[PDB]
Design a protein around this ligand. Structure first.
Ligand SMILES: C[C@@H]1CN(c2cccc(Nc3nc(N[C@@H]4CCCC[C@@H]4N)c(C#N)c4cn[nH]c(=O)c34)c2)C[C@H](C)O1
Length: 372
C-alpha cells in the first residue's frame, strides 16, 4: 500500500473543495491528502481542536517533508507521521490518527470520455458521456469556476444527497470526478431527455392515460423523497426526465436539502429562483418543505395537461407573486380531466397544511388513470 503512487492511495482526495474536506474529517486526528488547486501544492488536512488544519507538504530534492525528516514519497511521509505520532509542527502540536478513505462514488477522470453538450444547468453545462470500461452512457454536470465561492461550494451537494437514494423514479448517481479539476458529477444518461421538451414535441400524440402514468411516476418519486426528508425545491417539467420506455425520473437536485424536521429555511440569497413554480410561503418567508414541493407538483400537473405551456405567460415574477397573494391561480387546461384539476387546486392551497400529501397525490392520480 505504502509503495503505491500517491494517486492510487485511498486517503488521497485530489481536487476536493475545502468545504467537502470539513465534511469528511469527523474526529480529532482524522486526515486526508489533497492537491491545493490554487497553489498547485500537496496539502495534508487534519482535524484538530474541532477544525480542519491545512499543512503544505514541502518538496525539495525529490523529498517530501513538513518540518522534520524528508521522504522519497508522500505515502512514506504519511506512514512516518502516523507511525511515530510526531506532531506535524512543533508549534501546532497536530498529530495524525486516522486516514479518511475516499468513498465508493469517487471516479477517475480517465474512466470517463466527455461527449456533446446536452443542456445548461445553473452551475454550468451538462454533457453526454461514456464510461470507457463498459460503454455505459452518462450525463456529466460541470461547474464553472468563475461562479462565486459561496455558490461553488454547493455544487457537490446534489451528489452527496443522491448517494443515499435508489428509486425507479429518481435519477441515479454514478459517481463524482473529484480527483482532479475540472470537477464533475456523473449520472445515468436518461435517453428521452427532459419532460417539458417531450410534452411540447410529442404533444397531440399523447393519450391522457399516458400523461397520468407519467405524473403518477413523478408523484411516486416525490413520495420517496418526502420519505427520505428530502425537499427538492426545483420540481418542474424541465427537471423531470423521460426514459426510452416513457418512465419519468425526477432530476436536477442542485437546490435540494435534507431536513430531519421537514423544514428548510432559505438563506434568502438565492438567484434565479423558479418563482412561478414556488409556493408563496417559500418566497415570502423562505420556508421550504414537502408542502412547498406539493405546490410545485400542482404546477407540474398544469404543465403536463397543457402539454408544456408556460405558466403565468403574461406575468413577471413579481406580478405572479402579487397575483397569487390575491387568490389568482392558473386556469384549467382543455385536456385536463376535472378530477386532475381538483387535485391541482388542492396542491395550490394557500396554507401549506391544506395541501395534499404526495401519497394522496399518487393514489388519486392512479385512481383517475384507471378510469382512462
Ligand atoms: C437529444 C437528446 C437530449 N437528451 C437530454 C436532454 C435534456 C436533458 C437530458 N439529461 C439530463 N439533463 C439534466 N439537466 C438538464 C438541464 C437543462 C434543462 C433540462 C434538464 N433539466 C440532468 C440533471 N441534473 C440530468 C441528470 N442525469 N441524467 C440526465 O440524463 C440529465 C438529456 C439526451 C439524449 C440522449 O439526447
Amino acid at each position: 500500500e505504502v509503495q503505491k503512487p500517491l494517486h492510487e492511495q485511498l486517503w488521497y482526495h485530489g481536487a476536493i473543495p475545502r468545504a467537502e474536506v470539513a465534511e469528511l474529517l469527523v474526529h480529532s486526528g482524522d486526515f486526508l491528502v489533497r492537491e491545493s488547486q490554487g497553489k498547485q501544492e500537496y496539502v495534508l488536512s487534519v482535524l484538530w481542536d474541532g477544525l480542519p488544519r491545512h499543512f503544505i507538504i514541502q518538496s525539495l530534492d525529490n523529498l517530501y517533508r513538513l518540518e522534520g525528516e524528508g521522504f522519497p514519497s508522500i505515502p512514506l511521509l504519511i506512514d512516518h507521521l502516523l507511525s511515530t505520532q510526531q506532531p506535524l509542527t512543533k508549534k501546532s502540536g497536530v498529530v495524525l490518527h486516522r486516514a479518511v478513505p475516499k468513498d465508493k462514488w469517487v471516479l477517475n477522470h480517465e474512466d470517463l470520455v466527455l461527449g456533446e453538450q446536452i443542456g445548461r444547468g445553473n452551475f454550468g453545462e451538462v454533457f453526454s458521456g461514456r464510461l470507457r470500461a463498459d460503454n455505459t452512457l452518462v450525463a456529466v454536470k460541470s461547474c464553472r469556476e468563475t461562479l462565486p465561492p459561496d455558490l461553488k461550494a454547493k455544487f457537490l451537494q446534489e451528489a452527496r444527497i443522491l448517494k443515499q437514494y435508489s428509486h425507479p423514479n429518481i435519477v441515479r448517481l454514478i459517481g463524482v470526478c473529484t480527483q482532479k479539476q475540472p470537477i464533475y458529477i456523473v449520472m445515468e444518461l436518461v435517453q428521452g431527455g427532459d419532460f417539458l421538451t417531450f410534452l411540447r414535441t410529442e404533444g397531440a400524440r399523447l393519450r391522457v392515460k399516458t400523461l397520468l402514468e407519467m405524473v403518477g411516476d413523478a408523484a411516486a418519486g416525490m413520495e420517496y423523497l418526502e420519505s427520505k426528508c428530502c425537499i427538492h425545491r426545483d420540481l418542474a417539467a424541465r427537471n423531470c426526465l423521460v426514459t426510452e420506455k416513457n418512465v419519468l425520473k425526477i432530476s436536477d437536485f442542485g437546490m435540494s436539502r435534507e431536513e430531519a424536521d421537514g423544514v428548510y429555511a432559505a438563506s434568502g440569497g438565492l438567484r434565479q429562483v423558479p418563482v412561478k413554480w414556488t409556493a408563496p410561503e417559500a418566497l415570502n418567508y423562505g420556508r421550504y418543505s414537502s408542502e412547498s414541493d406539493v405546490w410545485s407538483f400542482g404546477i407540474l400537473l398544469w404543465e403536463t395537461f397543457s402539454l408544456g405551456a408556460s405558466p403565468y405567460p403574461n406575468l413577471s415574477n413579481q406580478q405572479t407573486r402579487e397575483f397569487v397573494e390575491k387568490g389568482g391561480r392558473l386556469p384549467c387546461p382543455e385536456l385536463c380531466p376535472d378530477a386532475v384539476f381538483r387535485l391541482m387546486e388542492q396542491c395550490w392551497a394557500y396554507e401549506p397544511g391544506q395541501r395534499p400529501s404526495f401519497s394522496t397525490i399518487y393514489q388519486e392520480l392512479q385512481s383517475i388513470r384507471k378510469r382512462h
